[PDB]
Amino acid sequence: MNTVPFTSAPIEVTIGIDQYSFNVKENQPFHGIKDIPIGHVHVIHFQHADNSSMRYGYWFDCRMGNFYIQYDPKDGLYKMMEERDGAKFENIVHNFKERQMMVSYPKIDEDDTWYNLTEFVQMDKIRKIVRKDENQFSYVDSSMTTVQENELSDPAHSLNYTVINFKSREAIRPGHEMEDFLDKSYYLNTVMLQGIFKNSSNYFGELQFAFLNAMFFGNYGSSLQWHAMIELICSSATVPKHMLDKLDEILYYQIKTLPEQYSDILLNERVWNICLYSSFQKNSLHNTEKIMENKYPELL
Amino acid sequence: GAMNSSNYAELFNNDIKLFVDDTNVYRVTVHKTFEGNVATKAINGCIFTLNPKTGHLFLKIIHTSVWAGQKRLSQLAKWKTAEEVSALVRSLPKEEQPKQIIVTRKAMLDPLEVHMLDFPNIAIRPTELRLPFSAAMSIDKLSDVVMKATEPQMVLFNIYDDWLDRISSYTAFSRLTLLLRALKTNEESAKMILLSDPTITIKSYHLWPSFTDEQWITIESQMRDLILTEYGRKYNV
Ligand SMILES: N=C(CC(=O)NCc1ccccc1)NO
């Protein structure tokens, strides 16, 4: 179990760690988060009390280095940094652990939620979408735009999600216009899965990564990407049986985890009604359709 | 965006544009089968592609053979329309290609947009106007060439005859839409009006009779009466 120590907490902030969150008061003696499960990516995220504008945070994998958080009073945010001196860090973590100034990652033993939300999300693969190669962790916030959003402005601060566009020459084979538009299987299976991603594991991870940024940061372009990747599968008549079954599981845990009160903004009525009730795969998402109908029957 | 009353004069500016109407592409008669079920029999149709500034009509005849063995024909008809319009654009020299294509029915937008991806600079637009182009098959010479076709065929017409020698394209389009609105509301009466006078003939190379300017004002007046007349018979006003 790994540890993200905090040098201090000088400003009142709500701190998230994966799907958990806690309030830290201004200058409270908070020195970080311990007992973080090894084997998964994680996200540590922030919303300042004095300005809920900009949720921001850091995707990281404790296997890739020793990361700590320290507030920067010039740039006005909690920054993640990598400690290279393993003995300073191990000593720092031990002293703070002895004074019990850390919160414990509060995972219920029965609970597989985080695993189920991040099964295909890797840090190196996450680094393709968020480019900042001098760091092993990745910053994301509410306002960052996606490459596709910029096409329709600062490229260094963009989310480089895979551009999906149903009315594009990439999506539509000359001479198969109606076929390819009404049944997107060639775009899904040949263009995206065999040509851009290499495998469905990679496709699901970006879909999961797009959902988590939408949910944790209210990142609108991430939400667009999540729905586009769902719609591309559901609008394909020919999808491998194992992808459909895994998709149903992925979406089930995403819908299960979504805050009830954010459904109005994080869920696109057209996509979901189309996917569950009109598309080729309208009968292939049993678990997802059941949780959607019992939890968000209004949207439908 | 969408073409409507507010931006109506844009039709007659010098930016090449075409209206595409797909109403008459997929045409059927519905009938009883020997077993007492219902079946459709397709008949020949046509795409109505019109330059409103010049009157040039590209009438692509859709022969019933294009439907053979196909499913979901009403959906296919939109995509076939879009395929044929795209093929027409590609056949034209660059300086004759349209800068905009206005579709009379919004269901044509995605089919045409997808077929025209190779032309990102051609705007595909809907319209809020309710244009009477469905009545094109009430023009005898157009109906004749469509029903006589034995294979796919494109026939070129000027739907304004020689009117543009004497009137502007705004006035010509207004006359055309009045005539077509009349034929659509009461075809028999409209054609009676157009042909009641044996001395006024249709030239072999024309679609409409050779009316003088003064006879056109009379004709136009009679068509507006008919459209109001039918509007009363329909609503009991
Ligand atoms: N196709 C890509 C993007 C990618 O590699 N997407 C997979 C992925 C998986 C987990 C997390 C984020 C992204 N680059 O060419």
XYZ file of C-alpha atoms and ligand atoms in Angstrom:
552
model
C 0.000 0.000 0.000
C 1.439 3.364 -1.145
C 1.292 6.909 0.169
C 0.908 10.416 -1.403
C 2.179 12.740 1.361
C 1.125 16.424 1.387
C 3.660 19.041 2.548
C 0.689 21.004 4.079
C -2.906 22.234 3.384
C -2.817 26.046 3.395
C -6.200 26.631 1.734
C -9.556 25.069 2.476
C -10.200 22.436 -0.160
C -12.306 19.381 -0.889
C -9.864 16.579 -1.765
C -10.899 13.605 -3.857
C -9.066 10.311 -4.114
C -10.662 8.093 -6.741
C -14.382 7.934 -5.829
C -13.810 9.173 -2.245
C -13.592 12.728 -0.973
C -13.059 14.677 2.218
C -12.969 18.298 3.344
C -9.757 19.889 4.621
C -10.006 23.162 6.508
C -7.643 26.106 5.968
C -4.283 25.309 7.617
C -5.608 22.021 9.017
C -2.771 19.577 9.914
C -3.380 17.329 6.928
C -0.354 15.512 5.552
C -1.731 13.161 2.948
C -3.327 9.874 2.013
C -1.987 6.428 2.937
C -2.971 2.796 2.178
C -3.512 3.501 -1.522
C -4.056 0.205 -3.375
C -1.188 -0.837 -5.548
C -2.089 -2.149 -8.988
C -4.424 0.539 -10.261
C -4.177 4.045 -11.598
C -5.525 6.608 -9.185
C -6.632 10.213 -9.354
C -6.211 12.807 -6.650
C -8.412 15.830 -7.210
C -9.252 19.149 -5.780
C -11.967 21.750 -5.490
C -11.112 24.877 -3.560
C -13.675 26.058 -1.048
C -13.318 29.725 -2.026
C -13.781 29.084 -5.757
C -15.496 25.902 -6.912
C -14.483 27.019 -10.414
C -11.902 24.593 -11.767
C -11.932 21.150 -10.344
C -8.426 19.860 -11.161
C -6.323 16.812 -10.327
C -3.602 14.317 -11.136
C -3.683 10.821 -12.544
C -0.848 8.710 -11.171
C 0.385 5.165 -10.496
C 2.423 4.750 -7.302
C 4.437 2.014 -9.001
C 5.994 4.677 -11.243
C 7.586 6.831 -8.545
C 7.145 8.537 -5.194
C 4.613 11.424 -5.627
C 3.793 14.141 -3.071
C 1.418 17.154 -3.142
C 2.517 20.694 -2.024
C 0.417 23.863 -2.465
C 1.994 26.604 -4.704
C 0.910 30.073 -3.463
C 2.017 31.684 -6.719
C 0.011 29.517 -9.113
C -2.669 29.002 -6.471
C -3.057 25.269 -6.626
C -2.077 22.000 -5.079
C 0.652 20.545 -7.326
C 1.818 16.962 -7.657
C 5.570 16.506 -7.630
C 7.917 13.467 -7.857
C 10.459 13.064 -4.964
C 13.663 11.473 -6.477
C 15.380 10.981 -3.051
C 13.864 7.717 -1.858
C 15.216 8.090 1.733
C 13.868 11.649 2.271
C 10.437 10.411 1.067
C 10.395 7.122 3.066
C 11.504 9.115 6.207
C 8.911 11.884 5.512
C 6.071 9.329 5.086
C 7.091 7.416 8.224
C 7.254 10.549 10.437
C 3.759 11.689 9.254
C 2.365 8.112 9.629
C 3.658 8.029 13.226
C 1.925 11.337 14.005
C -1.270 9.995 12.337
C -1.652 13.048 10.128
C -2.832 11.034 7.087
C -6.211 9.789 5.978
C -6.501 6.194 4.902
C -7.741 5.255 1.467
C -11.009 3.890 2.715
C -11.577 0.807 0.596
C -14.227 -1.629 1.795
C -12.855 -5.117 1.267
C -15.970 -6.363 -0.582
C -15.805 -3.404 -2.944
C -14.532 -3.721 -6.519
C -15.864 -0.362 -7.771
C -12.523 1.284 -8.535
C -11.153 -1.798 -10.265
C -14.330 -2.002 -12.321
C -14.060 1.654 -13.353
C -10.344 1.498 -14.292
C -9.873 -2.120 -15.652
C -8.318 -0.889 -18.996
C -6.886 2.525 -17.905
C -2.988 2.535 -17.849
C -0.766 5.564 -16.977
C 1.395 5.333 -20.174
C -1.876 5.055 -22.283
C -3.358 7.997 -20.233
C -0.114 9.930 -21.143
C -1.078 9.662 -24.894
C -4.251 11.726 -24.091
C -2.527 14.150 -21.606
C 0.952 15.137 -22.994
C 3.504 16.422 -20.464
C 6.386 14.034 -20.748
C 8.667 15.444 -18.047
C 6.173 14.175 -15.428
C 5.067 10.605 -14.639
C 1.630 11.827 -13.525
C -0.985 13.672 -15.576
C -2.866 16.881 -14.794
C -6.462 17.326 -15.893
C -9.027 20.022 -15.100
C -12.622 21.078 -15.819
C -11.733 23.485 -18.616
C -9.263 21.524 -20.756
C -10.499 21.059 -24.290
C -10.067 18.071 -26.558
C -8.215 17.945 -29.876
C -11.540 17.501 -31.676
C -12.991 20.441 -29.749
C -10.065 22.591 -30.971
C -10.727 21.600 -34.611
C -14.326 22.877 -34.532
C -6.981 26.502 -28.629
C -3.703 25.996 -26.729
C -2.540 22.576 -28.019
C -0.161 21.829 -25.125
C -3.075 21.809 -22.646
C -5.432 19.633 -24.719
C -6.901 16.159 -24.145
C -5.690 14.144 -27.182
C -8.636 11.678 -27.246
C -9.098 9.607 -30.438
C -11.132 11.852 -32.820
C -14.431 9.974 -33.728
C -16.633 11.675 -36.312
C -19.517 9.741 -37.885
C -19.715 12.055 -40.920
C -16.074 11.900 -41.927
C -14.171 10.254 -44.743
C -12.488 8.160 -42.072
C -15.870 6.788 -41.025
C -17.325 6.331 -44.511
C -15.902 4.170 -47.316
C -16.472 5.651 -50.782
C -19.293 3.679 -52.335
C -20.513 2.287 -49.008
C -21.997 5.604 -47.854
C -25.402 4.347 -46.723
C -24.034 1.036 -45.489
C -21.270 2.568 -43.381
C -23.411 5.379 -41.983
C -26.278 3.166 -40.899
C -24.033 0.270 -39.703
C -20.751 1.535 -38.283
C -19.036 -1.874 -38.029
C -16.239 -1.110 -40.500
C -15.398 2.124 -38.680
C -15.437 0.343 -35.300
C -13.698 -2.932 -36.215
C -11.320 -1.964 -39.048
C -10.611 1.756 -38.628
C -10.649 2.061 -34.855
C -10.043 -1.371 -33.260
C -7.591 -2.814 -35.836
C -6.019 0.455 -37.075
C -5.936 3.147 -34.306
C -6.246 1.293 -30.979
C -4.866 -2.303 -31.856
C -7.329 -4.057 -29.436
C -10.557 -3.548 -27.532
C -8.658 -3.407 -24.197
C -7.254 -0.065 -25.460
C -10.689 1.114 -26.771
C -12.400 0.436 -23.368
C -9.599 2.210 -21.421
C -10.050 5.495 -23.344
C -13.858 5.115 -22.911
C -13.286 4.595 -19.117
C -10.683 7.463 -18.979
C -13.179 9.788 -20.779
C -15.909 8.873 -18.336
C -13.787 9.421 -15.265
C -12.621 12.880 -16.401
C -16.225 13.783 -17.191
C -17.396 12.668 -13.772
C -14.580 13.939 -11.606
C -13.841 17.242 -13.323
C -17.072 17.977 -15.153
C -14.978 18.018 -18.320
C -17.447 18.451 -21.159
C -15.178 17.255 -23.954
C -14.470 14.078 -22.048
C -18.211 13.512 -21.743
C -18.554 13.945 -25.522
C -15.794 11.372 -26.075
C -17.362 8.862 -23.658
C -20.710 9.050 -25.442
C -19.119 8.871 -28.916
C -17.263 5.700 -28.022
C -20.461 4.126 -26.677
C -22.473 5.174 -29.680
C -19.869 3.824 -32.111
C -20.190 0.343 -30.581
C -23.994 0.412 -30.248
C -24.379 1.600 -33.865
C -22.329 -1.341 -35.194
C -24.248 -4.463 -36.231
C -21.129 -6.653 -35.979
C -19.414 -6.455 -32.608
C -17.522 -9.333 -30.940
C -19.591 -11.042 -28.251
C -16.931 -10.501 -25.593
C -16.793 -6.765 -26.309
C -20.542 -6.383 -25.865
C -20.517 -8.305 -22.635
C -17.599 -6.283 -21.303
C -19.167 -3.025 -22.478
C -22.328 -3.855 -20.512
C -20.226 -4.383 -17.381
C -18.202 -1.208 -17.948
C -21.284 0.955 -18.384
C -23.115 -0.665 -15.487
C -20.419 0.376 -13.015
C -20.209 3.858 -14.570
C -23.943 4.429 -14.247
C -23.846 2.905 -10.752
C -21.127 5.306 -9.645
C -22.498 8.482 -11.230
C -23.894 10.917 -8.637
C -27.667 10.893 -8.959
C -27.780 14.702 -9.048
C -25.319 15.052 -11.973
C -27.262 12.775 -14.320
C -28.982 15.733 -15.991
C -25.621 17.049 -17.229
C -23.384 13.955 -17.555
C -25.846 11.837 -19.576
C -26.927 12.542 -23.162
C -30.577 11.582 -23.666
C -30.245 10.978 -27.395
C -27.259 8.685 -27.115
C -28.711 6.555 -24.339
C -32.208 6.225 -25.774
C -30.671 5.358 -29.132
C -28.209 2.878 -27.645
C -30.667 1.088 -25.357
C -33.827 1.150 -27.499
C -33.031 1.693 -31.202
C -29.508 0.551 -31.976
C -28.244 -2.794 -33.197
C -27.110 -3.541 -29.655
C -30.385 -2.466 -28.005
C -30.797 -5.989 -26.575
C -27.147 -6.678 -25.685
C -26.729 -4.382 -22.657
C -28.975 -6.085 -20.107
C -27.199 -4.949 -16.955
C -26.771 -1.390 -18.173
C -30.378 -1.131 -19.381
C -31.675 -2.424 -16.050
C -29.689 0.019 -13.904
C -30.501 2.939 -16.231
C -34.225 2.145 -16.123
C -34.329 1.813 -12.341
C -32.053 4.767 -11.591
C -32.717 7.303 -14.392
C -36.115 6.422 -15.903
C -36.739 10.132 -16.529
C -33.846 10.441 -18.982
C -35.622 7.716 -20.963
C -28.365 27.615 -42.049
C -32.004 27.035 -43.026
C -33.488 28.901 -45.985
C -36.743 30.754 -45.274
C -38.771 33.895 -46.012
C -36.147 36.138 -44.414
C -33.329 35.126 -46.799
C -35.416 34.470 -49.915
C -33.541 36.736 -52.324
C -30.399 34.660 -51.805
C -31.900 32.235 -54.315
C -31.391 34.697 -57.149
C -27.894 35.940 -56.398
C -24.910 34.839 -58.445
C -23.741 32.020 -56.137
C -24.629 28.757 -57.911
C -27.205 26.754 -55.971
C -29.531 23.820 -56.487
C -32.763 22.753 -54.859
C -33.114 18.973 -54.542
C -36.601 17.529 -54.079
C -36.857 13.782 -53.463
C -40.622 13.538 -53.139
C -41.110 11.742 -56.460
C -38.107 9.390 -56.275
C -39.938 6.377 -54.779
C -43.463 6.112 -56.163
C -45.892 3.229 -55.655
C -49.432 2.134 -56.321
C -50.957 0.192 -53.417
C -53.221 -2.699 -54.374
C -54.930 -5.858 -53.119
C -53.348 -9.261 -53.709
C -55.314 -12.333 -54.727
C -55.135 -13.498 -51.099
C -56.636 -10.185 -50.003
C -53.402 -8.778 -48.605
C -51.923 -5.455 -49.682
C -48.850 -5.002 -51.844
C -47.093 -2.111 -53.530
C -46.071 -1.843 -57.164
C -43.335 0.680 -57.862
C -43.544 3.021 -60.816
C -40.843 5.186 -62.308
C -39.815 8.238 -60.347
C -37.503 11.196 -60.627
C -35.188 13.474 -58.684
C -36.068 17.141 -59.153
C -32.820 19.146 -59.034
C -33.350 22.773 -59.978
C -31.137 25.872 -60.323
C -33.625 28.613 -59.282
C -31.597 31.366 -60.932
C -31.359 29.864 -64.417
C -34.319 27.478 -64.511
C -32.037 24.573 -65.366
C -33.717 21.355 -64.234
C -31.630 18.171 -63.978
C -34.387 15.538 -64.004
C -32.831 12.208 -63.068
C -35.311 9.473 -63.905
C -35.391 6.660 -61.353
C -36.368 3.471 -63.089
C -38.200 0.823 -61.082
C -35.330 -1.614 -61.621
C -33.246 0.271 -59.061
C -35.571 -1.056 -56.348
C -35.398 -4.696 -57.355
C -34.518 -6.935 -54.424
C -33.892 -4.028 -52.127
C -35.298 -3.535 -48.639
C -36.505 -0.440 -46.757
C -37.150 1.391 -49.997
C -38.280 4.693 -48.490
C -34.916 4.888 -46.699
C -32.960 3.713 -49.702
C -34.625 6.366 -51.826
C -33.033 9.139 -49.792
C -29.557 7.591 -50.194
C -30.078 6.920 -53.919
C -31.155 10.555 -54.315
C -28.001 11.662 -52.530
C -25.843 9.301 -54.626
C -27.295 10.676 -57.863
C -26.948 14.353 -56.798
C -23.346 13.715 -55.773
C -22.702 12.019 -59.132
C -24.219 15.040 -60.908
C -22.016 17.458 -59.007
C -18.897 15.424 -59.852
C -19.920 15.388 -63.518
C -20.042 19.198 -63.681
C -16.970 21.332 -64.366
C -15.662 22.950 -61.201
C -16.990 26.370 -62.149
C -20.522 24.930 -62.581
C -20.642 23.065 -59.301
C -23.033 24.524 -56.726
C -21.845 26.366 -53.662
C -25.008 25.311 -51.794
C -27.573 22.516 -52.193
C -30.940 23.194 -50.523
C -32.988 20.029 -49.743
C -36.737 20.404 -49.584
C -37.092 17.655 -46.923
C -34.849 17.502 -43.844
C -34.474 13.716 -44.067
C -32.191 14.369 -47.060
C -29.625 16.260 -44.989
C -27.541 13.393 -43.627
C -27.672 11.252 -46.790
C -26.540 14.168 -48.918
C -23.943 15.376 -46.406
C -22.397 11.885 -46.306
C -22.324 11.545 -50.094
C -20.761 15.011 -50.428
C -17.949 14.598 -47.873
C -15.532 15.029 -50.789
C -17.004 18.578 -51.209
C -16.593 20.174 -47.771
C -17.121 23.612 -49.305
C -20.619 22.866 -50.676
C -23.136 23.862 -48.005
C -26.045 21.414 -47.537
C -29.077 23.326 -46.255
C -32.693 22.708 -45.302
C -35.518 25.145 -45.850
C -38.554 26.279 -43.892
C -40.323 27.022 -47.175
C -43.050 24.546 -48.154
C -42.258 24.349 -51.836
C -44.627 22.604 -54.224
C -42.012 20.698 -56.210
C -43.904 17.448 -55.618
C -46.280 18.734 -58.302
C -43.570 18.458 -60.972
C -45.153 15.238 -62.156
C -48.277 17.238 -62.990
C -46.326 18.906 -65.836
C -47.377 16.687 -68.721
C -44.058 16.598 -70.555
C -42.100 15.706 -67.398
C -44.574 12.996 -66.392
C -44.360 11.577 -69.943
C -40.589 11.223 -70.033
C -40.527 9.632 -66.571
C -43.245 7.065 -67.324
C -41.780 6.175 -70.720
C -38.271 5.507 -69.398
C -37.098 1.920 -69.755
C -33.702 2.525 -68.101
C -32.084 5.121 -65.821
C -31.848 8.437 -67.662
C -31.075 12.098 -67.036
C -33.185 14.620 -68.977
C -32.356 18.359 -68.983
C -35.078 20.987 -69.110
C -35.414 24.708 -68.530
C -38.435 24.875 -66.244
C -38.885 28.590 -67.026
C -39.128 28.093 -70.824
C -38.043 31.490 -72.280
C -39.425 33.554 -69.418
C -36.055 34.952 -68.415
C -35.889 36.945 -71.680
C -38.686 39.094 -70.266
C -38.765 38.682 -66.449
C -36.260 38.301 -63.639
C -35.476 34.998 -61.937
C -37.260 36.108 -58.778
C -40.443 36.674 -60.822
C -39.889 33.456 -62.770
C -39.518 31.413 -59.587
C -42.628 33.090 -58.162
C -44.592 32.170 -61.286
C -43.302 28.599 -61.183
C -44.179 28.091 -57.525
C -47.618 29.600 -58.074
C -48.249 27.248 -60.993
C -46.997 24.265 -59.030
C -48.903 25.203 -55.890
C -52.047 25.372 -58.076
C -51.400 22.033 -59.752
C -50.818 20.517 -56.314
C -54.040 21.922 -54.833
C -56.342 21.119 -57.761
C -54.613 19.561 -60.745
C -57.657 19.272 -63.009
C -58.682 22.907 -62.556
C -55.106 24.160 -62.882
C -54.663 22.330 -66.171
C -58.066 23.522 -67.362
C -56.901 27.097 -66.709
C -53.611 26.540 -68.506
C -55.178 24.909 -71.571
C -58.697 26.376 -71.770
C -57.726 28.540 -74.790
C -56.918 26.495 -77.940
C -55.130 29.426 -79.608
C -52.282 29.471 -77.048
C -50.002 26.499 -77.594
C -47.013 24.884 -75.890
C -43.951 25.081 -78.106
C -42.321 21.719 -78.812
C -39.237 22.876 -76.858
C -41.262 24.287 -73.904
C -43.150 22.993 -70.896
C -45.794 25.706 -70.437
C -47.991 27.615 -72.903
C -46.763 30.629 -74.878
C -48.635 33.284 -72.951
C -48.168 36.951 -73.601
C -47.209 39.118 -70.650
C -50.847 40.179 -70.315
C -52.152 36.628 -70.560
C -49.698 35.613 -67.828
C -51.175 38.206 -65.474
C -54.630 36.792 -66.168
C -53.364 33.219 -65.748
C -51.547 34.082 -62.531
C -54.720 35.735 -61.218
C -56.779 32.632 -62.022
C -54.255 30.411 -60.217
C -54.445 32.544 -57.074
C -58.256 32.347 -57.208
C -58.027 28.543 -57.499
C -55.679 28.331 -54.540
C -58.050 30.474 -52.494
C -61.096 28.663 -53.941
C -59.688 25.287 -52.848
C -58.630 26.744 -49.521
C -62.319 27.504 -48.938
C -63.690 24.196 -50.200
C -61.173 22.522 -47.887
C -61.854 24.619 -44.772
C -65.513 25.640 -45.416
C -64.692 29.382 -45.296
N -5.179 5.239 -29.903
C -4.539 6.179 -29.202
C -5.071 6.615 -27.847
C -5.000 5.426 -26.865
O -3.939 4.837 -26.726
N -6.140 5.110 -26.185
C -6.135 3.975 -25.243
C -6.255 4.399 -23.809
C -6.367 3.429 -22.818
C -6.390 3.795 -21.501
C -6.320 5.122 -21.142
C -6.227 6.084 -22.121
C -6.194 5.724 -23.457
N -3.402 6.737 -29.739
O -3.105 6.438 -31.009
